[PDB]
Design an enzyme around this catalytic site. Structure first.
Site, PDB file in Angstrom:
ATOM      1  N   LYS A  15      23.616   3.027 -25.155  1.00 50.23           N
ATOM      2  CA  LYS A  15      22.592   2.586 -26.085  1.00 50.23           C
ATOM      3  C   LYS A  15      22.751   1.130 -26.501  1.00 50.23           C
TER       4      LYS A  15
ATOM      5  N   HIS B 139      -6.614  28.802 -48.553  1.00 49.85           N
ATOM      6  CA  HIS B 139      -6.491  30.199 -48.139  1.00 49.85           C
ATOM      7  C   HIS B 139      -7.615  30.616 -47.196  1.00 49.85           C
TER       8      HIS B 139
ATOM      9  N   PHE C 253      19.562  19.638 -34.891  1.00 53.91           N
ATOM     10  CA  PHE C 253      18.578  20.303 -35.728  1.00 53.91           C
ATOM     11  C   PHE C 253      19.257  21.296 -36.652  1.00 53.91           C
TER      12      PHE C 253
ATOM     13  N   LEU D  37      14.549  24.490 -24.252  1.00 56.77           N
ATOM     14  CA  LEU D  37      13.941  25.676 -24.854  1.00 56.77           C
ATOM     15  C   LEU D  37      12.422  25.628 -24.713  1.00 56.77           C
ATOM     16  N   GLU D  38      11.825  24.446 -24.819  1.00 58.65           N
ATOM     17  CA  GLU D  38      10.377  24.324 -24.656  1.00 58.65           C
ATOM     18  C   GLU D  38       9.965  24.819 -23.274  1.00 58.65           C
TER      19      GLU D  38
ATOM     20  N   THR E  80       8.218   9.312 -29.018  1.00 54.01           N
ATOM     21  CA  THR E  80       7.126   8.449 -28.594  1.00 54.01           C
ATOM     22  C   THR E  80       6.475   7.644 -29.718  1.00 54.01           C
TER      23      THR E  80
ATOM     24  N   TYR F   9      15.872  20.579 -26.939  1.00 53.54           N
ATOM     25  CA  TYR F   9      14.482  20.969 -27.197  1.00 53.54           C
ATOM     26  C   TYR F   9      13.700  21.061 -25.889  1.00 53.54           C
TER      27      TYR F   9
ATOM     28  N   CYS G 113       5.976  14.670 -23.187  1.00 56.24           N
ATOM     29  CA  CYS G 113       5.146  15.302 -24.217  1.00 56.24           C
ATOM     30  C   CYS G 113       3.831  15.881 -23.703  1.00 56.24           C
TER      31      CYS G 113
ATOM     32  N   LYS H  40       4.139  18.705 -21.040  1.00 58.80           N
ATOM     33  CA  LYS H  40       4.896  19.781 -21.687  1.00 58.80           C
ATOM     34  C   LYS H  40       4.022  20.560 -22.678  1.00 58.80           C
TER      35      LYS H  40
ATOM     36  N   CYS I  39       6.651  10.033 -21.611  1.00 58.81           N
ATOM     37  CA  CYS I  39       5.755  10.861 -22.395  1.00 58.81           C
ATOM     38  C   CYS I  39       4.507  11.292 -21.616  1.00 58.81           C
TER      39      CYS I  39
ATOM     40  N   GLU J 260      -0.171  27.298 -46.553  1.00 53.85           N
ATOM     41  CA  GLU J 260      -0.207  27.531 -48.008  1.00 53.85           C
ATOM     42  C   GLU J 260       1.066  28.173 -48.559  1.00 53.85           C
TER      43      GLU J 260
HETATM   44  C1  LIG Z   1      10.494  17.158 -21.481  1.00 54.26           C
HETATM   45  C2  LIG Z   1      10.192  16.153 -22.558  1.00 54.26           C
HETATM   46  C3  LIG Z   1       9.402  16.511 -23.655  1.00 54.26           C
HETATM   47  C4  LIG Z   1       9.131  15.560 -24.650  1.00 54.26           C
HETATM   48  N1  LIG Z   1       8.347  15.930 -25.730  1.00 54.26           N
HETATM   49  C5  LIG Z   1       8.055  15.017 -26.730  1.00 54.26           C
HETATM   50  C6  LIG Z   1       7.247  15.401 -27.805  1.00 54.26           C
HETATM   51  O1  LIG Z   1       6.810  16.551 -27.863  1.00 54.26           O
HETATM   52  N2  LIG Z   1       6.954  14.499 -28.824  1.00 54.26           N
HETATM   53  C7  LIG Z   1       7.439  13.207 -28.759  1.00 54.26           C
HETATM   54  O2  LIG Z   1       7.162  12.434 -29.667  1.00 54.26           O
HETATM   55  N3  LIG Z   1       8.239  12.810 -27.697  1.00 54.26           N
HETATM   56  C8  LIG Z   1       8.564  13.705 -26.670  1.00 54.26           C
HETATM   57  N4  LIG Z   1       9.365  13.315 -25.581  1.00 54.26           N
HETATM   58  C9  LIG Z   1      10.184  12.049 -25.727  1.00 54.26           C
HETATM   59  C10 LIG Z   1       9.366  10.863 -25.212  1.00 54.26           C
HETATM   60  O3  LIG Z   1       9.018  11.119 -23.879  1.00 54.26           O
HETATM   61  C11 LIG Z   1      10.115   9.532 -25.280  1.00 54.26           C
HETATM   62  O4  LIG Z   1      10.719   9.425 -26.554  1.00 54.26           O
HETATM   63  C12 LIG Z   1       9.217   8.309 -25.044  1.00 54.26           C
HETATM   64  O5  LIG Z   1       8.631   8.355 -23.754  1.00 54.26           O
HETATM   65  C13 LIG Z   1      10.013   7.008 -25.237  1.00 54.26           C
HETATM   66  O6  LIG Z   1       9.297   5.840 -24.863  1.00 54.26           O
HETATM   67  P1  LIG Z   1      10.084   4.620 -24.142  1.00 54.26           P
HETATM   68  O7  LIG Z   1       9.123   3.453 -23.901  1.00 54.26           O
HETATM   69  O8  LIG Z   1      11.314   4.277 -24.974  1.00 54.26           O
HETATM   70  O9  LIG Z   1      10.632   5.165 -22.699  1.00 54.26           O
HETATM   71  P2  LIG Z   1       9.691   5.655 -21.497  1.00 54.26           P
HETATM   72  O10 LIG Z   1       8.383   6.148 -22.048  1.00 54.26           O
HETATM   73  O11 LIG Z   1      10.332   6.705 -20.649  1.00 54.26           O
HETATM   74  O12 LIG Z   1       9.443   4.338 -20.635  1.00 54.26           O
HETATM   75  C14 LIG Z   1      10.424   3.785 -19.813  1.00 54.26           C
HETATM   76  C15 LIG Z   1       9.708   3.287 -18.569  1.00 54.26           C
HETATM   77  O13 LIG Z   1      10.285   2.078 -18.100  1.00 54.26           O
HETATM   78  C16 LIG Z   1      10.581   2.201 -16.728  1.00 54.26           C
HETATM   79  N5  LIG Z   1      11.767   1.410 -16.364  1.00 54.26           N
HETATM   80  C17 LIG Z   1      13.071   1.714 -16.574  1.00 54.26           C
HETATM   81  N6  LIG Z   1      13.798   0.698 -16.100  1.00 54.26           N
HETATM   82  C18 LIG Z   1      13.005  -0.243 -15.600  1.00 54.26           C
HETATM   83  C19 LIG Z   1      13.275  -1.460 -15.010  1.00 54.26           C
HETATM   84  N7  LIG Z   1      14.529  -1.863 -14.867  1.00 54.26           N
HETATM   85  N8  LIG Z   1      12.226  -2.238 -14.578  1.00 54.26           N
HETATM   86  C20 LIG Z   1      10.926  -1.792 -14.747  1.00 54.26           C
HETATM   87  N9  LIG Z   1      10.676  -0.575 -15.344  1.00 54.26           N
HETATM   88  C21 LIG Z   1      11.711   0.189 -15.753  1.00 54.26           C
HETATM   89  C22 LIG Z   1      10.742   3.679 -16.475  1.00 54.26           C
HETATM   90  O14 LIG Z   1      10.371   3.931 -15.153  1.00 54.26           O
HETATM   91  C23 LIG Z   1       9.782   4.306 -17.446  1.00 54.26           C
HETATM   92  O15 LIG Z   1       8.513   4.484 -16.853  1.00 54.26           O
HETATM   93  C24 LIG Z   1       9.645  14.247 -24.563  1.00 54.26           C
HETATM   94  C25 LIG Z   1      10.439  13.914 -23.451  1.00 54.26           C
HETATM   95  C26 LIG Z   1      10.712  14.860 -22.465  1.00 54.26           C
HETATM   96  C27 LIG Z   1      11.564  14.477 -21.291  1.00 54.26           C
HETATM   97  C1  LIG Z   2     -18.358  35.016 -47.899  1.00 52.48           C
HETATM   98  C2  LIG Z   2     -17.244  34.456 -48.732  1.00 52.48           C
HETATM   99  C3  LIG Z   2     -16.243  33.688 -48.133  1.00 52.48           C
HETATM  100  C4  LIG Z   2     -15.200  33.167 -48.904  1.00 52.48           C
HETATM  101  N1  LIG Z   2     -14.208  32.410 -48.289  1.00 52.48           N
HETATM  102  C5  LIG Z   2     -13.162  31.886 -49.040  1.00 52.48           C
HETATM  103  C6  LIG Z   2     -12.149  31.125 -48.445  1.00 52.48           C
HETATM  104  O1  LIG Z   2     -12.155  30.895 -47.230  1.00 52.48           O
HETATM  105  N2  LIG Z   2     -11.114  30.609 -49.222  1.00 52.48           N
HETATM  106  C7  LIG Z   2     -11.073  30.853 -50.584  1.00 52.48           C
HETATM  107  O2  LIG Z   2     -10.162  30.394 -51.264  1.00 52.48           O
HETATM  108  N3  LIG Z   2     -12.066  31.599 -51.176  1.00 52.48           N
HETATM  109  C8  LIG Z   2     -13.112  32.120 -50.421  1.00 52.48           C
HETATM  110  N4  LIG Z   2     -14.105  32.873 -51.048  1.00 52.48           N
HETATM  111  C9  LIG Z   2     -14.144  32.817 -52.559  1.00 52.48           C
HETATM  112  C10 LIG Z   2     -13.032  33.713 -53.108  1.00 52.48           C
HETATM  113  O3  LIG Z   2     -13.100  34.996 -52.510  1.00 52.48           O
HETATM  114  C11 LIG Z   2     -13.136  33.784 -54.621  1.00 52.48           C
HETATM  115  O4  LIG Z   2     -12.944  32.482 -55.130  1.00 52.48           O
HETATM  116  C12 LIG Z   2     -12.078  34.692 -55.231  1.00 52.48           C
HETATM  117  O5  LIG Z   2     -12.294  36.037 -54.850  1.00 52.48           O
HETATM  118  C13 LIG Z   2     -12.084  34.557 -56.753  1.00 52.48           C
HETATM  119  O6  LIG Z   2     -11.591  35.744 -57.339  1.00 52.48           O
HETATM  120  P1  LIG Z   2     -11.985  36.173 -58.838  1.00 52.48           P
HETATM  121  O7  LIG Z   2     -10.648  36.623 -59.421  1.00 52.48           O
HETATM  122  O8  LIG Z   2     -12.659  35.039 -59.592  1.00 52.48           O
HETATM  123  O9  LIG Z   2     -13.052  37.419 -58.719  1.00 52.48           O
HETATM  124  P2  LIG Z   2     -13.231  38.490 -57.509  1.00 52.48           P
HETATM  125  O10 LIG Z   2     -12.255  38.283 -56.383  1.00 52.48           O
HETATM  126  O11 LIG Z   2     -14.640  38.557 -57.001  1.00 52.48           O
HETATM  127  O12 LIG Z   2     -12.989  39.914 -58.160  1.00 52.48           O
HETATM  128  C14 LIG Z   2     -13.739  40.422 -59.214  1.00 52.48           C
HETATM  129  C15 LIG Z   2     -13.499  41.918 -59.178  1.00 52.48           C
HETATM  130  O13 LIG Z   2     -13.865  42.504 -60.413  1.00 52.48           O
HETATM  131  C16 LIG Z   2     -14.846  43.513 -60.222  1.00 52.48           C
HETATM  132  N5  LIG Z   2     -15.718  43.641 -61.412  1.00 52.48           N
HETATM  133  C17 LIG Z   2     -16.876  43.006 -61.718  1.00 52.48           C
HETATM  134  N6  LIG Z   2     -17.287  43.435 -62.922  1.00 52.48           N
HETATM  135  C18 LIG Z   2     -16.427  44.321 -63.402  1.00 52.48           C
HETATM  136  C19 LIG Z   2     -16.385  45.046 -64.579  1.00 52.48           C
HETATM  137  N7  LIG Z   2     -17.316  44.940 -65.520  1.00 52.48           N
HETATM  138  N8  LIG Z   2     -15.334  45.916 -64.757  1.00 52.48           N
HETATM  139  C20 LIG Z   2     -14.344  46.055 -63.799  1.00 52.48           C
HETATM  140  N9  LIG Z   2     -14.401  45.307 -62.642  1.00 52.48           N
HETATM  141  C21 LIG Z   2     -15.433  44.461 -62.456  1.00 52.48           C
HETATM  142  C22 LIG Z   2     -15.518  43.099 -58.947  1.00 52.48           C
HETATM  143  O14 LIG Z   2     -16.048  44.257 -58.389  1.00 52.48           O
HETATM  144  C23 LIG Z   2     -14.375  42.545 -58.124  1.00 52.48           C
HETATM  145  O15 LIG Z   2     -13.666  43.558 -57.457  1.00 52.48           O
HETATM  146  C24 LIG Z   2     -15.158  33.414 -50.289  1.00 52.48           C
HETATM  147  C25 LIG Z   2     -16.171  34.188 -50.881  1.00 52.48           C
HETATM  148  C26 LIG Z   2     -17.214  34.692 -50.104  1.00 52.48           C
HETATM  149  C27 LIG Z   2     -18.297  35.509 -50.742  1.00 52.48           C
END
Ligand SMILES: Cc1cc2nc3c(=O)[nH]c(=O)nc-3n(C[C@H](O)[C@H](O)[C@H](O)COP(=O)(O)OP(=O)(O)OC[C@H]3O[C@@H](n4cnc5c(N)ncnc54)[C@H](O)[C@@H]3O)c2cc1C
Ligand SMILES: Cc1cc2nc3c(=O)[nH]c(=O)nc-3n(C[C@H](O)[C@H](O)[C@H](O)COP(=O)(O)OP(=O)(O)OC[C@H]3O[C@@H](n4cnc5c(N)ncnc54)[C@H](O)[C@@H]3O)c2cc1C
Lengths: 484, 484
Positions: free
Chosen positions: A306, A463, A219, A194-195, A334, A191, A55, A58, A50, A468
């Site tokens: 194994k 949102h 998969f 392709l990675e 890992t 994997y 991991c 990579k 790893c 979501e």
């Molecule tokens: C390209 C690649 C990408 C991967 N990506 C991910 C990922 O994204 N996410 C994830 O969770 N896992 C990933 N893995 C899998 C992960 O690497 C292994 O599942 C993990 O390392 C397993 O741990 P381990 O202790 O069983 O074996 P290892 O970590 O390989 O350890 C075995 C060690 O023991 C040593 N050894 C072997 N025989 C002896 C011996 N006789 N005497 C002394 N030492 C010895 C070896 O030299 C080695 O260093 C990836 C693997 C590869 C190859």
């Molecule tokens: C700067 C900012 C950042 C935000 N970021 C997030 C976020 O990251 N995530 C999130 O979930 N929410 C966020 N919000 C909050 C979110 O936008 C509101 O919770 C959401 O728009 C609620 O919608 P509503 O239906 O209650 O009213 P609104 O979406 O405000 O709509 C009310 C509409 O009715 C109109 N209206 C008012 N009076 C009348 C009337 N008398 N007649 C006809 N139309 C009228 C208004 O003009 C408006 O168009 C943010 C808001 C702001 C200001």
């Protein structure tokens, strides 16, 4: 009585997690780690796959690719960037290697601080409770322990063809490669395949993926094919139903030029292509064969390599335990290895009874468009509960961040698989979109709590955030309604 | 009997969600929307606050800032980018407004397709079941309906001081501003205030935030302070315990120069500063006062302007309903308005009994470092359950993506609040880090399922993803142990 309370063979994710936890309870622990080199000579430090060669590097290169797209996106958001920015391989590798080095060191310090003996030697059982450790210069030492943990991991598999070991690279070599690979062939559809195809393409390289049959075996195939379609639409070339039969060097270099001859899977058709670099990502082999398990009586599956183990990670020999990728029919990730190591230590030395739960473990594939999954694939759900009892809710989505760059609508995709016989239980979760892992983590926790469709529907979305989409899924596959 | 089955007053998130859903059951629906202009003359199209002047443009500009960071990050990952890239305000606005316009249109077509009459007129009750609608050119028309839905939203509040209406802008004007604001004072500490302060700084502008008392009233104050610390560390200036008493024009322009005189909150001390633009983000006032509620008998809270309503969104007048920000003591977010509108239509016209669940609704503040929250703040948990029954697990984390750029370690922060009297139920969830919303969404679903610390600990992380920090939280605030 014995030299150590516990000797861990292998200093990867699992081994080190076990070591650190065991030492917390005052137990005398030794970790043996030794990285046998690549055919081409590549070695690395402590921490396992790893950290060094999996991991971490990579994901970092996947980030280099993502930042490539960020540069493009930035233009429409108003940033005045030169139309095409070039990328430097060597600089990226230096930065990645630098980070890996600090982790290598981090672990070495961590073990010293917790009073764990680290020995850079290759471990090998010689008899009951006994192990021989062979260091780099060749010197042997014999040690004994009350218990042992096999945490030995796997290494990349080669095709049994001429030129593979001498001219091709694996994931092991790629992440420290001292030159830009240039035009690349990635052989495989795992994997890892392709990675790597994906980020090599994201850095601007010409990438081809040669596949034997299906993408991402294991998969959900509907998602698998969506991932592939996306890669193909964004530069990556695919050769389907071909396997290389010979690789030969046209010219040596850094990179050189190689000819790859490949044969069709269903006919005698042969094709040739020339590449700068050829990457073999066709799976991994367990390191359980050359560690002396016969001398001590530990049973393994001789076909797959194994180790069968109890739900408590115990082998057939009571004092010997195994964790990680090595395990038969578990999950090869890992954090699973880490949880298994931690919990084993606690069971052994702190009176806990808590076991490692290998059910519904989430993953994420870091393809150009990321794929996060937890629970059953659609296929497997139908197999288990019956087609008629499975309802699949799905929807496309368009990340707000992509609207101004004006790209890739109706490409990100969300589906959940629900079991009608069980309160519309969400037995499967799948997302194709940005930050798939960040999105999937918490829904993984919701599955552990037995999330239901009524409960998911009652949860309010945040949102505007990609995740979501899961709050308001109302269209089923069965309905046949369109989701554009 | 009546002209329409339902007349919706206000064409925002909630109103339009109600309209679309009601029409699906063959009901005759009319939406009245009218955007009364800003003091400075700014108007916009259909869709309400979110679409035109809220979440959508706000997140888009937040992305413009994030992409600024991405350009800096990209260098260490190997991309050859010019050391400082400049940003163009006008181009950003053109792109944002272009997107808002497509949404404006999107709704206009959506309502046409679903046979919903849209009238760009200002609604005002004149008597039982009757409403007068005044269009832009001033013409009045009277309409009747069997039921009515007040979805009238709010508008930005001004300080009662000289120069505010004439020289200052609000969130309403900012997102269509036809010139770069330049040196800006943001008055307020609401999420809108900090979000805008943040992205204006992220595009390279000189930003100051003037606060009356605390940051982010209503939110967990430990997190609030951390968000403020981060903003201050990344350029943003803060003036604490001051409120403006007068704003005057030194020179008109685009932007001009303005002098702001402010008075201390606890003394007679007065300070002056000059800015190009002054934005007032000090809260919002309900649009419930000038819509004729007296003529029809609907009770409101005369102090706050909000409308009290049943758990079924019904006012004291049986045939009149209200949703959205207007509601008393609910949750003022777009997706809550939408859910409330959908579910009300379904209760009214499709025999449903499902109510809108306003408990543990997640939010995300899109500050430079994003803050995602679900459930109880630490303070509110202590108040409810008692300090001695609350265990707070926390940890810092370091996104892998930030290691190569080599920035902001020990800055991202995760905490969960557990109730010991109820199986360590996770009653509060808080994250400060990238993609906080994506991380929080699924944990929101987990809280709907009654997630427990035992369950959370049993869930395996996804590696290497920020969200995985929640899988292994072991250090409590009560323990006093360090989390660096
Ligand atoms: C390209 C690649 C990408 C991967 N990506 C991910 C990922 O994204 N996410 C994830 O969770 N896992 C990933 N893995 C899998 C992960 O690497 C292994 O599942 C993990 O390392 C397993 O741990 P381990 O202790 O069983 O074996 P290892 O970590 O390989 O350890 C075995 C060690 O023991 C040593 N050894 C072997 N025989 C002896 C011996 N006789 N005497 C002394 N030492 C010895 C070896 O030299 C080695 O260093 C990836 C693997 C590869 C190859
Ligand atoms: C700067 C900012 C950042 C935000 N970021 C997030 C976020 O990251 N995530 C999130 O979930 N929410 C966020 N919000 C909050 C979110 O936008 C509101 O919770 C959401 O728009 C609620 O919608 P509503 O239906 O209650 O009213 P609104 O979406 O405000 O709509 C009310 C509409 O009715 C109109 N209206 C008012 N009076 C009348 C009337 N008398 N007649 C006809 N139309 C009228 C208004 O003009 C408006 O168009 C943010 C808001 C702001 C200001």
């Amino acid at each position: 009585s014995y030299d150590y309370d516990l000797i861990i063979i292998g200093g990867g994710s699992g081994g080190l997690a076990a070591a650190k936890e065991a030492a917390q309870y005052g137990k005398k622990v030794m970790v043996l780690d030794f990285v046998t080199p690549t055919p081409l000579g590549t070695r690395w430090g402590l921490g396992g796959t790893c950290v060094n060669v999996g991991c971490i590097p990579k994901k970092l290169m996947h980030q280099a690719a993502l930042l490539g797209q960020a540069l493009q996106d930035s233009r429409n958001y108003g940033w005045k960037v030169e139309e095409t920015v070039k990328h430097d391989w060597d600089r990226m590798i230096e930065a990645v290697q630098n980070h890996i080095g600090s982790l290598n060191w981090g672990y070495r310090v961590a073990l010293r601080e917790k009073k764990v003996v680290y020995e850079n030697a290759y471990g090998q059982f010689i008899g009951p409770h006994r192990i021989k450790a062979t260091n780099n210069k060749g010197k042997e030492k014999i040690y004994s322990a009350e218990r042992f943990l096999i945490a030995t991991g796997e290494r990349p598999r080669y095709l049994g063809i001429p030129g593979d070991k001498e001219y091709c690279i694996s994931s092991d070599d790629l992440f420290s490669l001292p030159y830009c690979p240039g035009k690349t062939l990635v052989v495989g559809a795992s994997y890892v395949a392709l990675e790597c195809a994906g980020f090599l393409a994201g850095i601007g390289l010409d990438v081809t993926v040669m596949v034997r049959s299906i993408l991402l075996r294991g998969f959900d195939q509907d998602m698998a094919n969506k991932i592939g379609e996306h890669m193909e639409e964004h530069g990556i070339k695919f050769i389907r139903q071909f396997v290389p039969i010979k690789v030969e060097q046209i010219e040596a270099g850094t990179p050189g030029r190689l000819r790859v001859v490949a044969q069709s899977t269903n006919s005698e058709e042969i094709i040739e292509g020339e590449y700068n670099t050829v990457m073999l990502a066709i799976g991994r082999d367990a390191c359980t064969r050359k560690i002396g398990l016969e001398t001590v009586g530990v049973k393994i599956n001789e076909k797959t390599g194994k180790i069968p183990v109890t739900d408590e990670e115990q082998t057939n020999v009571p004092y010997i335990y195994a964790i990680g990728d090595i395990l038969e029919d578990k999950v090869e990730l890992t954090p699973v290895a880490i949880q298994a190591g931690r919990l084993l230590a606690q069971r052994l030395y702190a009176g806990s009874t808590v076991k490692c739960d290998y059910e519904n473990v989430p993953t994420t594939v870091f393809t150009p468009l990321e794929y996060g999954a937890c629970g059953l694939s659609e296929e497997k759900a139908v197999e288990k509960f019956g087609e008629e009892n499975i309802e699949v809710y799905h929807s496309y989505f368009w990340p707000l961040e992509w609207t101004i760059p004006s790209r890739d609508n109706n490409k990100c995709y969300a589906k959940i698989i629900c079991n009608t016989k069980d309160n519309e239980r969400v037995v499967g979760f799948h997302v194709l979109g940005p930050n798939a892992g960040e999105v999937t983590q918490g829904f993984a926790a919701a599955l552990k709590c037995g999330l239901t469709k009524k409960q998911l529907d009652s949860t309010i979305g945040i949102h505007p955030v990609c995740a979501e989409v899961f709050t308001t899924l109302s269209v089923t596959k069965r309905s046949g309604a369109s989701i554009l």
